Structure formats: structure tokens, C-alpha cells
Design a protein around this ligand. Sequence first.
Ligand SMILES: C[S@@+](CC[C@H](N)C(=O)[O-])C[C@H]1O[C@@H](n2cnc3c(N)ncnc32)[C@H](O)[C@@H]1O
Ligand SMILES: [Mg+2]
Ligand SMILES: [Mg+2]
Lengths: 383, 362, 49
Amino acid sequence: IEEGTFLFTSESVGEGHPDKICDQISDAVLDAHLQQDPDAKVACETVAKTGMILLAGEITSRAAVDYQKVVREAVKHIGYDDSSKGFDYKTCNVLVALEQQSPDIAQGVHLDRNEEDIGAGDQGLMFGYATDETEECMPLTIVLAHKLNAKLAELRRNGTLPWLRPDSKTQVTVQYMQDRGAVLPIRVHTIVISVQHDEEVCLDEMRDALKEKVIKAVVPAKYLDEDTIYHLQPSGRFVIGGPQGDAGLTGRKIIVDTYGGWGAHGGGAFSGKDYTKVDRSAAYAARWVAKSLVKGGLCRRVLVQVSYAIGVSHPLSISIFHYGTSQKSERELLEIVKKNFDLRPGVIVRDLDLKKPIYQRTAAYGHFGRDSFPWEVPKKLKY
Amino acid sequence: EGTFLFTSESVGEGHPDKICDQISDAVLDAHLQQDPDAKVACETVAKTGMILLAGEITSRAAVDYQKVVREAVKHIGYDDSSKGFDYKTCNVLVALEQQSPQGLMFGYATDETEECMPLTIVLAHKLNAKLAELRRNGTLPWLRPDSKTQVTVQYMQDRGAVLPIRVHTIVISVQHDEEVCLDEMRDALKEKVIKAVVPAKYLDEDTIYHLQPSGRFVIGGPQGDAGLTGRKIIVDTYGGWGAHGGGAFSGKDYTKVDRSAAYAARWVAKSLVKGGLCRRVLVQVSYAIGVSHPLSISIFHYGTSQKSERELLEIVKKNFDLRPGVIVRDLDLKKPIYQRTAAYGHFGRDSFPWEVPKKLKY
Amino acid sequence: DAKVACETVAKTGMILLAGEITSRAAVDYQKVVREAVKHIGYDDSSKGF
Ligand SMILES: C[S@@+](CC[C@H](N)C(=O)[O-])C[C@H]1O[C@@H](n2cnc3c(N)ncnc32)[C@H](O)[C@@H]1O
Ligand SMILES: [Mg+2]
Ligand SMILES: [Mg+2]
């Protein structure tokens, strides 16, 4: 029997996954610049590889930044500090290939303009999405996936599971049922967890620990039953992880960073980018809008699209899809959005306080669904 | 009025990120020619005067990476320092670790174009193709390889399907030389590029044109913006439509299910629409650890099918075998034709096996 | 009083700086390297660099 049921799955990766190392390093570099120069123009790409971190991209800033220190301190905090773990901050190669921002981009975007008039730093499309299925207005699949990795990191850093290393991958498969445009998560179907580990600890001590200390502490019992499949350390000997024998890049976990397959994505990455890059600021803005609509009671689920042209301040297009979860028309919801939001980057930066150096926080465990971020605090709407 | 806008973008061959995708798949192609069973996971990074290869390779082939990268950059059009990049003089760095011898995928199809793709991205892709073509002709010799495009189309909802009405907005940014002036570029982009790509019935007096909106675009390619493999995955796929699980395509060989099953899911989706069973469809394939066949397949036909989801699933099960091994055999995925996929989108063009609709028997 | 031990590598398309510097100075290495190459006279593909 089936009705209108389906499976959906989302992954998250821990801080030590090579791609997410790059994301966090790029955001550490951005924060370092914003501490001294709030108007810094940053486009930092990081590359992680056996024994190597390379910084490539472009930065115009008044800050004096010691790239060797910021990169190595980041790798330190992530937990790579010895050969035994496959990577050491003290002894890794750090190359830097950073130049100024193209003057052609500067003149065309932000030079000699009032803040509210600065153009989009690029063309692009960005999506925002919210769903009433969790308190945090996010898909349960991605939320559980993130929180599992966060738990592993927690239990690693407070010594309670000292055999854990920084690299990890989780996949949460939830069984869903459609409900008049909304989606009801019914049960957790499958949970996969691969995590990098000590030489000493035996396989089934880890597996016991992943179930009893990680999953039990994270996933409400209401979603777990006797049929739920657990794939804990499925391959077995995952002692080799992180950059060693692997190659990661900034912006190769954009789906993990956002909605875990749900809603939509326009393909712009977040990390290493100041507010003038609308891939970040407009995506943050669009999440804010989507969450505001659902928390404001105007719909149970929603997807928002916005687009920009480089050097132009106002969005080229804005669109709302409520999946038929609102009594009001999508056009009416658009009218409400137009009245309550100003989606130019020069304004978004004020409303969301995006010159603050708090970006490294966002580089793991997802950019959405968390308490402290301005874009997760819904706006009271007037209509 | 039941009307909505949707936007998609695409980029040119000279776009830093697309440069990297093409080189990554050029490395793959070259390996597959000598060794059909080569394992490749090759990332490319691009920046002023630099091409860096990084990744894992288990292959019997001996590849001249120098020649591979340099011929790729040549083909793309970067052949002088005046253009910001030159195949003859760039730095090629190799850091590949070579040796000697699960997932959720989405496929999507819509009947709004012959190629069975969203109009927004099809046009975006074709505008870049046109620029490349007119650059290579000599018709517009001030053009340079790096370019971006973005198309916003006004749609009308029609019982599950989406009906294009008009083009709302068009963006074109293309790197250029230092002689040509701004009015000449804008006239040309409008009259020689757009009007040769977009059907006239979609263009009108209200269509907005942002052409060379930055005002100057001389500095381009890896000099103006670092490039990385796998940073244009929405451009590679459905331009904001359908759905995407996370995996990049280029630099990966056919044994990665992220690539080859995404191709297969597309094949199914297109076959359903071309077979008249749907006007629009999204195909979900869940794979699971320790099973060859998909663990579960869902089919969202948006109410455009007369047949139910269970009926469409049954049709899918007797015409398709979605076990990785069979997919690479059926679609001929061991062959070295991955470089042509690395610009202008992986879906939409008939030349690919997964874009050949299967005649369905039910 | 800067402590400087800078080794430079030069090949097709590349200048690599490798070594050890402890200094209170703010040096833009990109400009400094490019300016020196400009002064040597390598300013076009037709010269090989
Ligand atoms: C504008 S850049 C990204 C932002 C950049 N990293 C920065 O430092 O601001 C992204 C892409 O836009 C295109 N681009 C580069 N320079 C441009 C210009 N002056 N005008 C319009 N588009 C440009 C290129 O295709 C490039 O890869
Ligand atoms: Mg970018
Ligand atoms: Mg990019």
C-alpha cells in the first residue's frame, strides 16, 4: 500500500570533510578581513588536498591579514594536528594566490555609489525556502543530518568520545506523506553515518556509540521504530579521511549548505564572499522572506526566487510558489513581499547586519535553521 | 493572473568555472581512450596564469597533462596575454595521486521545448553558444571567450504544465577587447545574438535588456575570477527547475553514480514526456547501500499524466534497468565523450545517449 | 630590521615565493613581483612571459 507516500534523503558532512574544510577556511579569511575593514571585497576560494591548502581568488581590503595564521588556526580548530590523522596544521603546505578585485568589476558594481545603490556583485538566481514540518522551518531530513554531525563534533571536543576524528558523512532518509501541498514526515527510514576514527577503537564499540550517544541524543523517538535501518560505519575501516588521499574545494557542498535537496537552488556558493556577492546576501534574504511567510501564517510551505544583473541594484525578478498551501494567491503573496522587503544588496546588508564577521559559524552544519542568525528571525509583516 | 516569472542562467566556454569543468572532463576523456576502466576524480582550479590539477586517478593510461590542458585552453580561445590568459604560456601544475590497478538522483523533463527542457535555460545556453560561434567566425571579432547569460521567462500555469508566454528580461555579459565601444556591443548583442536565438514571438517592446550592464568587461577569464571544477551544477542541469541532490559531474568517471544515474534519470524523464505519458515530470531515484536496483522510485507528473504514479512506475520498471552497471552499458558511458558535456549543459542536446528517447512498450 | 630569507622560483607562467620573513612591513607581494618582471621587460606572450 502507498497512497501519496515517498522517500526523501539529505546529507550533511562534518567539518573535516575536505570540501567543508575549504568552506570554513574561506569564511575564516572573510571574517579576518571584516574584523578590520567592514567594506572589504572578498572572493576567497580555498583548495584542500594531501598536505596542501591553496587560497585562490580576489580581495580588495584595508586589513592586514596573515594568511598563514588564519589558515593554520582554522585547520587547528577543525582538529587536524598530527600525521596520524592524515593532516597537520603545524606542518601542512599553505599556498596563497590572491589578487585585488578586478577594477572592471569595482567600477561596475560599487565604486562612487551610495550604499543603497550598489549593484549586484554578479548576475545570478537565488532561492529561499521554508516548511512548517519542523520548528526551525526546515526539512527534517537535512536538520537531522546536520545535527548528527554537530553531535559527533561535540562528543569529540569534550573528550566523551576521544576516538572520533574530524571527517564525517551522514545521510538521513525520511518517509514522507503529502498533505495538501505541505509534507508530513512520518518516520525515519534509514540513517547512514560514516565517521573518521582512531586506530585502537573496535568496530562495534563505535556502532554502539553512534546509536546510543549520537542518534538517541538527536532524533526524537517519535520518528524511530523497529524497522528503521541503521548503516553505522558501513564499509568498516574508515581510518583514512580528511584531505589525505582526497581533493576538496570551496562551494562543493551547496546543497548541504541549504535545503538538502528540497526547494531549489540557483547554484551560487556562499563561503568566501562578502555581502556584495548576491549568491550569499540574496539567498540569506530569500530564506528570511520564506521563513517570515510561514511563521507569519500565510502558508505552510513556500519557495521564493530572486534574480539579479551585475551592476544593477533592484532584483530583475521575484517569484513565489506556495505549493497551494495558502488561501491567498501567489500573486497576493508577492504583493505582500514587495511591500515588506527591499532586496537590494545595499539594503539587505543593513537589515541582516552582513558586515559582521560571523560567517565562519555558517560554514558547517548548514546556513539555515539556526537560532542566532538575523535571517532566521522572521519579520512581522503588514498587509 | 496565474502568471509567474522564472529565471535561469548559463555561462560560456571561457568562464573560469566552465574552463575547469572542460579540462577535468578532458583529463577524463584522455584517460578513457587508453583505459576504458580508468577511475578518475579530477578537480581543476584556475586563476591568473595557472591551471592546477588535483585528485585521485587509478588508471593504466599515460597522459600528457601538459598537452591535454593546453589544447583545451586553446580550443576555448585563450591564446594571448592581451586576453588575460594564454595556452602557450600558462602555468600547469599537476598534483594528481595516480595508482595502478548511497545516493538520491533526480531526472526532469518538460514539454515546453523540442529539447524537452525549460525554455529559460535552453535560451541561456544558446545565447552563449551563439557568442562563441560569432567569436570564432570572425563576425564579432571583439568578443572574447568568458561570458554569462540569464533569461527570465514569463510563464502561465496550465493544468500541471507551464506555458511560456514571453521573455521578460535578458542579461548578457561578455568579455571584450579595448577598441569596440559600448553602443556597438549592445546593438550587436541585441541584433546578431538575441534575435538569432530567441523566437520572435517571445520578444516584444516590453522585454528588458541588460546588455554589458557592468559597463566594462576587458579583464576576464581566470584573471577576473578564480575558477573551480563543479561550481556550475545548476547550469549543468535544470537551471533552477527539477531538483538536485548535490553531486558535480565533471572530472568523475562513469563508476560514480552521481553522474551516470543522473544521466539515466534524465533519460527516463525525457522518455516519459516524448512518449506522451507526461507533459512534465520529475523522476526520483533512491539508491541504497547493498542493492543493485533502486530502493525506491517516485514520479511526480504534476497531474499531467492520465495514468497514475503506480502505472507510470510499472511502465518504467519493464522498459528500464537502473542498475549502475547496466546504465553504463546501455548508454555507452565508457567512451571518451565527456568533454562535450562540460559546457552548454549536460541535458538538452540530442547528441548524447541519455537524450535519445527510448520507445516505450507497455 | 626585517628578517628576510626569500627564495624565488621562476618557470613557464609562474613566479613562486618560498621562504621565511618576519617583518613589521605591509608588503603586497603581487605588485612587488609583477613590477620587477615589468622592469625586467617581460610584458607579452610574444616574449614568452
Ligand atoms: C563578477 S565575477 C565574481 C565576483 C568576483 N570574484 C569579484 O571579485 O567581485 C563572476 C563572473 O562574472 C563575469 N565577469 C567578470 N568580470 C566582469 C565584468 N567586469 N562585468 C561583467 N561580468 C564580469 C565572469 O564571467 C566571472 O567569472
Ligand atoms: Mg562566483
Ligand atoms: Mg564561480
